[PDB]
Amino acid sequence: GFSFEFTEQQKEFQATARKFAREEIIPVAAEYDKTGEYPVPLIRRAWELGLMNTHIPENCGGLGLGTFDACLISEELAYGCTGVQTAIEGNSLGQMPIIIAGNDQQKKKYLGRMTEEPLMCAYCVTEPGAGSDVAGIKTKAEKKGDEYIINGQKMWITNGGKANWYFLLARSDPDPKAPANKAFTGFIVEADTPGIQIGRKELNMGQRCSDTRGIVFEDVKVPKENVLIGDGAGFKVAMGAFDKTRPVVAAGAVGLAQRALDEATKYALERKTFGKLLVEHQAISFMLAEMAMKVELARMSYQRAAWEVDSGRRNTYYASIAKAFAGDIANQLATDAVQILGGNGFNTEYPVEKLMRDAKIYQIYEGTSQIQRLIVAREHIDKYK
Template identity: 40%
Template sequence: MKVERELPSREAYELLELVRDVAERELRTRAAHFEDSGRFPRDTFRLLGDIGLLTLPFGEDIGGGGQPYTVYLQVLEEIAARWAAVAVGMSVHTLACHPVVAYGTPDQQAELLPQMMSGHTLGAYSLSEAHAGSDPAALRASATEGPHGWTAQGTKAWVTHGGQADFYTVFLRTSPDPRNGISCFHVEADTAGLIAGVPERKMGLRSSPTAEMHFENVFLPADRLIGTPGQGLAVALSALDAGRLGIAAVAVGIAQAALDYAVGYAQERETFGRPVIEHQGVGFLLADMAAKTEAARATYLAAARRKDSGRPYTRQASIAKLVATDAAMAVTTDAVQVLGGAGYVLDHPVERLMREAKITQIFEGTNQIQRLVISRHLAVPTL
């Protein structure tokens, strides 16, 4: 079912039509095969980069698409409805570009942004560690300052695009200070001593590689520090709010795909002499799935409008991530139920969508962390 959208300009409507067309032709037809084989679709990201989709929310003055977040997120949703791993990759690339855009010096931006905004390079965001997934202040991977730069040691975990990215935005401990001891670095993939681990064997998003990245005496020139020493945690958290909106949009795309498939199946499958959609038990289940999906979409768009207007949106981003990903898990589970036994086999995509929905409740901050963020903001006046 084509989603009815409210967009701010004719250009935005044309962009969404282009995205739907490309996603139908180039993504939907390939997704199942790449997911089954666990192959990374690097050529797909090159295609999306060539048509300008990898840098949509960044300003035109630096080579981006100049689109508001309300538009960019709906692009992610359309992509996710066809191939969630690709949409996640787009969101991660945006996350990896953010520190240079927001905190880089003019010289760093002049050197790095042309390639980052070209669509020909793909970024990775390296914050988490095995013991510090939801507590970035507990990072142990470190960088020690020397006369000409920094030397990095340690291991980052759960790196999307690990071993495949062209550059890594990496957060390393540069002092013992628990809050102001983390710094942000831009690291090229071919830097000596940067070694990718074996990709994780995952429940879903199998075409999106996730791996540890090992830093073995990695020398980082002084001009690869983004922001000031000790500013890394602020840099990381500023990016995560936007990243959570990206995952919310991806989750809604997954939910929409599951809803659409379940509705189509329920219209064609007959029991007791009529389509199963006409049975109240199934019809009401589908109605609840539709309500959850549309409510989740409205929630992430409300948060995006705050971001676009320059207002604080941390609490709203956490609400959107929580609501949308819980909705995706519920909707995909119900889609399997609508199909019955057919939903449990690989012949239909709903089992894959259910597996993909699960990770959205975990990365970019687990939904338990989102509840913590929301609860802490309840006593703070909203601007």
């Protein structure tokens, strides 16, 4: 029957993640955000505690955890800080295509190294000319004997300057009229290959401690063995990685919203205006109640999506619902929390403004809200045929 109770192992994972977050990430998150420095010690500590690369199977040396455990761990880490959590989950996002569409040789070679030492990997799909239209990318992969020549440029690549290897999606079919199901090929490109020109670090409004760079490929030689299932099969692999990665980003948004709610409540429990405690004004109490409702609903949505994908079904409908709702409620919670603190909320010495700046990408990256609504509408309509 229905159940909303964690297992003992999941409880242990949640306790470890919460302890690590609230005892390591929080004391230094503000400094890392202010300086924009890459949190190498925090990433190493997360790797040591087994909070990173959770999806790697036990055969390759990983823990082989499901998406539910990854979601709860990512929620705790995002409660810690969203930039650090994004940097950590970039590894899982890059690894997912290799895990789901890789043979034994590729899996061992490109995941045992991740298990042995705290390395990083990226997910190079987005281009300057097409970010939402995945079929609109123009990076070309030309086959030359036993190698592929890749030319093009990618933009907004998380861990672009820190990754050990990249998952690259390029258009193998030169025919513009070729269908998207047979035109794109996935590759495993090492970061040290000649011809890769990593661009400057991009400065963003939020999550300033994470590394986001543009990458330019110029006559990069990729061996034939570093190809996925085959030519023209890249698009399906890229689209199938989303079904397992979207609940994680939804969980991160939920954790950010939970942090904002905690800060707002803790501030409202001590501030006094008009001779009464700030929580004794009905407007503030109703605001807090609505924030709590949104947080609980978003958490339930992402947990449902994670359980759905973990059970072997397709969770595109639930994953899109959870991602969209979490992205919206994260921004709403962040702005409400900034409103609650008043003038101190607008100041940079209080955590709420950082959360407000960080919450914006959850409506942009990993599929914008409009794309999520498109997917939800398509699935809903298909349910009526």
